[model samples]
Target: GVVAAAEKTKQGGVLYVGSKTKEGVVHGVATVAEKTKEQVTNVGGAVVTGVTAVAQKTVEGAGSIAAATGFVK
Candidate 1:
């Protein structure tokens, strides 16, 4: 889902993060182009570098997990 959002943002599109509850799905759409320049600077990596390095590290970590589990795709 995050990857898809990033791709849309790259193309100067929008992304909506919605929630589903007992009532219904509420949509909260966010336009990437409207975000602060800093926020859109690196999109994916921005979340990692600006927010938490764990975000960047997770990509590598997932590979390790897949290797250990022999989940070759």
Candidate 2:
């Protein structure tokens, strides 16, 4: 909180850490935050897809493999 710069500006005020402002917010920081959120979401989706594929493949391989006694089932 900063003491108001002027008589009109209040006394003891909290300044924006990044984009938050009384008028609204800084565009660049907002854009960057939004972009970062999107990237993280995309990364999460990609990881889920990859893990699903690997798990499916492993299950299929195990089902295909059956070496108990003989191979003439």
Query: Please, what is the TM-score per model?
Result: 0.14, 0.10
Clashing pairs in 1: none
Model 2 residue 69 CA deviation (Å) reads 59
Highest-TM-score candidate: 1
Which 10-residue window in model 1 sums to the lowest lDDT? 61-70
**Candidate 1 lDDT, tens digit per residue, 1-73?**
1232212223455545454446443333344555343332223322333211233225331111111222357
Please give the distance, in angstroms, between residue 68's alpha carbon in candidate 2 and its true position after superposition.
54
Estimate the overall C-alpha local distance difference test score of candidate 2: 0.27
Task: Go through the candidates in order and give each one's C-alpha lDDT.
Answer: 0.31, 0.27
RMSD of 2: 28.5
- Please identify model 1 stretches exceeding 4 Å from their true place: 1-20, 32-42, 45-73
Q: What is the lDDT of residue 7 in candidate 2?
A: 25
Evaluated against the true structure, the overall lDDT of model 1 is 0.31
